[PDB]
Design an enzyme around this catalytic site. Structure first.
Site, short mmCIF file in Angstrom:
data_model
loop_
_atom_site.label_atom_id
_atom_site.label_comp_id
_atom_site.label_asym_id
_atom_site.label_seq_id
_atom_site.Cartn_x
_atom_site.Cartn_y
_atom_site.Cartn_z
N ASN A 182 10.07 -45.93 -3.05
CA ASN A 182 11.16 -45.16 -3.58
C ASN A 182 10.66 -43.68 -4.11
O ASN A 182 11.73 -42.79 -3.63
CB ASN A 182 11.84 -45.92 -4.85
CG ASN A 182 11.02 -45.87 -5.94
OD1 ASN A 182 9.92 -46.18 -5.96
ND2 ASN A 182 11.65 -45.71 -7.25
N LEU A 183 9.80 -43.55 -4.49
CA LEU A 183 9.40 -42.03 -5.02
C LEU A 183 9.23 -41.26 -3.60
O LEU A 183 9.32 -40.05 -3.82
CB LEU A 183 8.27 -42.11 -5.81
CG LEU A 183 8.33 -42.57 -7.01
CD1 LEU A 183 7.22 -42.97 -8.11
CD2 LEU A 183 9.43 -41.97 -8.08
N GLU A 238 5.56 -44.72 5.55
CA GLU A 238 6.71 -44.43 6.71
C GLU A 238 7.70 -43.35 6.20
O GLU A 238 7.98 -42.47 7.17
CB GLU A 238 7.28 -45.52 7.27
CG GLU A 238 8.17 -46.39 6.37
CD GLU A 238 8.01 -47.84 6.50
OE1 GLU A 238 7.02 -48.28 7.17
OE2 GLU A 238 8.79 -48.56 6.15
N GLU A 239 8.15 -43.34 5.20
CA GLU A 239 9.39 -42.61 4.61
C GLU A 239 8.73 -40.92 4.76
O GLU A 239 9.70 -40.01 4.91
CB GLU A 239 9.97 -42.79 3.28
CG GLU A 239 10.78 -44.24 3.48
CD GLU A 239 11.85 -44.29 4.62
OE1 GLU A 239 12.45 -43.38 5.02
OE2 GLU A 239 12.03 -45.37 5.12
N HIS A 243 -1.58 -52.77 -9.15
CA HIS A 243 -2.88 -53.79 -9.37
C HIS A 243 -4.04 -53.25 -8.34
O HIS A 243 -5.11 -53.87 -8.87
CB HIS A 243 -2.30 -54.94 -9.02
CG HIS A 243 -3.14 -56.26 -9.34
ND1 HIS A 243 -4.29 -56.68 -8.32
CD2 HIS A 243 -3.44 -56.79 -10.46
CE1 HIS A 243 -5.11 -57.55 -8.85
NE2 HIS A 243 -4.55 -57.86 -10.02
N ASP A 247 2.72 -58.41 -13.81
CA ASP A 247 1.73 -57.20 -13.76
C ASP A 247 2.43 -55.81 -13.83
O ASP A 247 2.07 -54.82 -14.44
CB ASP A 247 0.73 -57.27 -12.63
CG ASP A 247 -0.41 -56.42 -12.84
OD1 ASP A 247 -1.37 -56.62 -13.58
OD2 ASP A 247 -0.35 -55.10 -12.10
N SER A 272 -7.99 -55.95 -21.59
CA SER A 272 -8.51 -57.23 -21.71
C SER A 272 -9.44 -57.70 -20.37
O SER A 272 -10.41 -58.33 -20.31
CB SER A 272 -7.63 -58.39 -21.73
OG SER A 272 -6.70 -58.65 -20.76
N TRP A 273 -9.03 -57.30 -19.19
CA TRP A 273 -9.58 -57.55 -18.03
C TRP A 273 -10.81 -56.86 -17.58
O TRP A 273 -11.57 -57.23 -16.83
CB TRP A 273 -8.67 -57.21 -16.65
CG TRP A 273 -7.48 -58.34 -16.32
CD1 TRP A 273 -6.25 -58.18 -17.41
CD2 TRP A 273 -7.63 -59.51 -15.78
NE1 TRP A 273 -5.48 -59.37 -16.99
CE2 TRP A 273 -6.28 -60.22 -16.11
CE3 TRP A 273 -8.39 -60.21 -15.12
CZ2 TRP A 273 -6.02 -61.40 -15.63
CZ3 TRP A 273 -8.22 -61.34 -14.39
CH2 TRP A 273 -7.11 -62.20 -14.69
N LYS A 325 -10.10 -53.60 -16.67
CA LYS A 325 -9.72 -52.44 -15.51
C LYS A 325 -9.51 -50.94 -16.08
O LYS A 325 -9.34 -49.89 -15.41
CB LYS A 325 -8.28 -52.89 -15.18
CG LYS A 325 -8.22 -54.45 -14.42
CD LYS A 325 -6.80 -54.85 -14.39
CE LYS A 325 -6.82 -56.03 -13.41
NZ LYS A 325 -5.37 -56.83 -13.64
#
Lengths: 336, 356, 336, 356
Positions: free
Chosen positions: C79-80, C109-110, C261, C289, C299-300, C302
């Protein structure tokens, strides 16, 4: 440590087992299970007898209602009385399962009006211009014809005449809660929440009672019969005293705004509620009280530090009948 | 060999759009940083940026209408509204929830009231008291995630990611109790009939501090409606005070007549509503009394799907007659702490010359 | 302890001071100020020289792009790119201000299609039936005529012919990132994000590149020219190696889903990003997520435990140009 | 003396509504607790309860259509779809995000696949791997507010209010590496061209456990599409494995042909989509290839205002041709962990007799 596991439909559709399985399903299903536990704790406390010492302190109010071991405050926004949750709330009030009601003006008047004319199903997307041209008012995906309010006007104006006369010739000092009791007695209909509330000596607080159709009618009425006063200060003493002299309290709050803050602020006067369940769709990130998590209320003293409050992030039209099914409705015999 | 029906469905022909049609295009930072041009580009950026641009246009239409001259009988207007405030060509109602007065938006609102740019204020109890308390002691930055137990043990109250010490309310108590004494004395011996708006005017005069919204509102004769004024710290204090000095009454009926007549006798009205709840419903219901507001902007984060009035789109209010069918109302889905200062920068603050 | 205070318009409209005042305004304005600080920390790190030891380790990749002290991953939803934020992103990529892009198929593509035909402003409430009958596709309050995709088909099919021929006669093993570089080179237009990305050796990852119009066209093309392969495994090695051999990393993530993610999971391979800013409107309560707070990612692994990540709860069409104005655009000279 | 225009605006006359019109009425607990009657009352309760009732009706229409007999050429259908799955009168696509497989909704979905009640699955990488990992080690209840630093120091990963120990992924690694070895060997010497769906079928056969969604999907020939299958723990493992045993390729092009032909050659289609993102868009885009799905139910908490596909209403998909103009799609705005078991109870689980 409890493992995640959902209901296994190979067992067939055992509805009680399916509802009980929400607790181990995760996300808001788990919060629903926690809410069932919190409300059942309120009920189990409420049915515990008062000791001599507790009875003494708790009898220190000038309230007609018999005392219990847990005073339950039930708050709900106007939309829920337009919805069929009106029937759920009426049932709890009819059977003395809660002790104090807090709602907005619409939450009062739409219960009374439903005794005069129904609300209908519609759609969220219906356009306001065409609805307005047909005199149909939209509430979410519900529809109220403007004649509903015509009927309300005809019903209410003679009562407003009597309230002004009782004020001016009998010394009555009206407040929102006293008006709501009188309107419930006048509607005289077992489908009405407020009929049962006044019959069962359950007070209803609504400090902005002028913010709706009741206000419309009071406003028009004031030009032919001026001088009606609705004092909100006395009602503040009344709600706060219900919290201060409770043995324990529980809060069950559907939606946000004044209904949520007013119940929570009353319970701050006792240094916090013992039990609390919130059901609403508001989010915290804009800082609104409506969207605040229960743990914000803990910082204020509105919920005790040792409580285990629960918020279910959901439309109460889905969750509240399920909650009642798993809690109050299972102990109905005790409340009769 | 590509299936024909698939090709027909995905590559269907189009109609030409109206020549009116505005193309999407964002601000180009190869121009450098011109903040006015950047804000102006929100209109063609899409999604809520486009709604922001529409909100700028709606508020500027309110202001331009307000600045049109008008001939009207001062005396009759004042008698019908029981207000000293002179009528303008557009009566602007500004509503905001309590959290926004704890935030720095307090300064934004204070600016508008100080310069007489809006005509009616509606807020909740917290939206009154936290403005007054900020003249006695500040609110601090914190975090949403701070735990209630530790905060409570330290006498700190959380408001979102803001923090207020308990001592703020102790200072408020000391300031307020003598004023409540005077209000009871004036009620009982000078015939004063207190309402929330009259109390809020008095508190603004008493705080006597130009940082206060309500100081400026009373000085400029801008009434403040708050029909549940007992629902907060002011209520706490009125409650405690009543056991030391009984008898204060706050009537909400006369305040209903006052706000409704502000709408009924308006030439035009605009609504600028930050947040939901009573502040939104009370302004809109007053405007139903004239068959609807001419202009309306909402800024809030509430969603429609639970049927709440807070989350309702402006087009729900059109069905009720709270907004005219011919109006072009705008909702911006956003935290007003972000968007309201930008909106004011592009609207009221640009027209400061006219308001002096 | 910092006091709450908003911008005072009695000072006039000093826009830089007004933006700086968001930091002490509260709620999401304060989070915006924190995001400005986090992005400025990424930039200040990026402009710090590499030491001999850091240069050695960081040069261990087979990537053409010169090394910097902070590798910035920029992720954004489709969308952005339909919105005018396409121009904001193009500017950052044009001037080498970020190092890795992650987006969905629509986000690729957009951008290319906007070089062939524009997107228009509309309204959220426009009805799908009447739009479909006129061949107008809705994206939020934006509108894309179906002929845009006709034009895309005409442009893309000859390129697909060449990619299959290069695959089958020159040993090319296509992946999404290699296709996106080729499409950016083909579009050959300075308004295109992907034109600048391939020119500046900025890789673009999109593991579900078939999920949109590109996929539509590949699908139709496969019936006349079968056998095109897009491998996602090689692209997984490529993105993970960008994180593993970075001196420091920052994540700037607009929206949720795979773009969020996939960037975060790559940074788990280095035991976490050093800096992170999220801008999205998703909420945590359903466990998604997309709606998770930055502290879930901690916690992960990341996000590093010592990082000070920030989420701004807002539509990025409002906030992202303001963020860029207060950060990257102020240091443009350093990036040229 | 009440102003006439005010009276006219507030007390405007109405039109009579269609005799069709359904009145609002909630379940009456004076009847006791009959849970079927309680769920049925959601239809007339309003707001999202009414949308739940509509969703029950849409899914039951999908099921009733699916159970209608059909004559069709087995051989041509199989050649055009390259699928062994027999065609039915309604092809149902079920999509769900990763979090729902970490939740207990894993059991709900597993039941539907076990009894062959849906025809196509679409999920993200997490939605594949967490089903397999749950056959090796459990997921636990926790809280949303648990702090990441303390969890990370204890080797515990948070998923909402759920918790997964790091050791779960160590067990997954040990289980998966030999299978990846076999996949590379089959690619290089037996001509296998791996895609996500083919990998997911193999992993379900290997896990060989009736608690697994993907075990049942492969046994019942229900394909699973996941075009970003590398975006999770499976990706981590494929990545590490490739440095020990290089060369595995996963092609997404052939999987695009497989899902699109499932839609193109359907008699009717229904979409049941839990959550947003790729799972929602990929199912809907496949159905654009037949000019739209005949039935559709969405359950998610995303909102439209940021323009995201995740938050788009079903009526946006109608504009694209992803849903037929004649369809009556339904979105329920709710956490699917609450609503999906109730939906299944009132739909698929009632028709179990027909599916055996």
């Amino acid at each position: 440590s409890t493992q995640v596991r959902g209901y296994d439909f190979n067992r067939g559709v055992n509805y009680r087992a399916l509802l009980e399985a929400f607790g181990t399903t995760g996300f808001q299903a788990t919060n629903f299970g926690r809410a069932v536990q919190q409300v059942n704790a309120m009920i189990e406390k409420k049915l515990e007898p008062l000791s001599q010492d507790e009875d003494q302190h708790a009898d220190l109010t000038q309230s007609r209602r018999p005392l219990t071991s847990c005073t339950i405050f039930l708050g709900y926004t106007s939309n829920l009385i337009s919805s069929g949750i009106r029937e759920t709330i009426r049932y709890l009030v009819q059977h003395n399962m809660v002790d104090v009601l807090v709602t907005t003006a619409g939450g009062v008047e739409e219960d009374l009006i439903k005794c005069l004319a129904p609300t209908y199903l519609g759609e969220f997307s219906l356009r306001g211009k065409e609805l307005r041209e047909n005199g149909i008012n939209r509430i979410g995906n519900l529809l109220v014809p403007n004649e509903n309010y015509c009927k309300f006007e005809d019903w209410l104006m003679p009562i407003l005449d009597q309230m002004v006369m009782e004020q001016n010739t009998e010394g009555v000092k009206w407040t929102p809660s006293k008006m709501i009791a009188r309107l419930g007695k006048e509607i005289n209909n077992p489908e009405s929440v407020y009929y049962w509330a006044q019959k069962n000596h359950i007070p209803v607080f609504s400090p902005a009672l002028t913010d709706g159709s009741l206000g419309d009618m009071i406003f028009f009425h004031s030009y032919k019969n001026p001088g009606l006063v609705l004092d909100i200060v006395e009602d503040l003493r009344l709600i706060n005293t219900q919290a201060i002299f409770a043995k324990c309290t529980g809060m069950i709050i559907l939606g946000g705004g004044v209904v949520k803050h007013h119940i929570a602020n009353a319970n701050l006067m006792r240094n916090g509620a013992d039990y609390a369940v919130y059901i609403n769709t508001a989010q915290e990130f804009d800082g609104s009280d409506s969207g605040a998590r229960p743990d914000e209320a803990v910082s204020w003293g509105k919920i005790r530090v040792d409580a285990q409050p629960v918020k279910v992030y959901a439309d109460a039209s889905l969750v509240f009948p399920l909650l009642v099914a798993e809690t109050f409705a299972q102990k109905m015999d005790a409340f009769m």
